């Protein structure tokens, strides 16, 4: 049993053996283009652009 060591990352079939989730990931997600609320304190900028 386990004659060879097959890399879960390199081999997609061993990944399915270890990761019964890799079938459904969709890692990339659009969490932008929704009127991005530029967040920066004005006094934070004042102390940033000092000295």
């Amino acid at each position: 049993a386990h004659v060879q060591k097959k890399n879960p990352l390199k081999n997609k079939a061993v990944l399915s053996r270890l990761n019964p989730y890799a079938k459904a990931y969709k890692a990339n997600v659009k969490i932008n283009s929704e009127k991005t609320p530029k967040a920066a304190g004005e006094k934070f900028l004042s102390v940033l652009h000092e000295n």
């Binding site: 386990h2 097959k6 890399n7 053996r17 270890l18 990761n19 019964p20």
Partner: protein
């Protein structure tokens, strides 16, 4: 944390360096701690569980 356990994560089964290439190995040793697969092993390590 994920990549080290996948590519280089070897168990300690009967004081032997047994590779973790199947989910049955972890649960045979860590079944008592509700760890039953590699994802749980990562979660027990990354989140530092009990």
């Amino acid at each position: 944390v994920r990549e080290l356990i996948y590519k280089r994560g070897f168990g300690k089964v009967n004081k032997q360096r047994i590779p973790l290439s199947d989910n049955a190995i972890i649960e045979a040793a860590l079944g008592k701690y509700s760890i039953l697969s590699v994802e749980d092993l990562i979660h027990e390590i990354y989140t530092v569980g009990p």
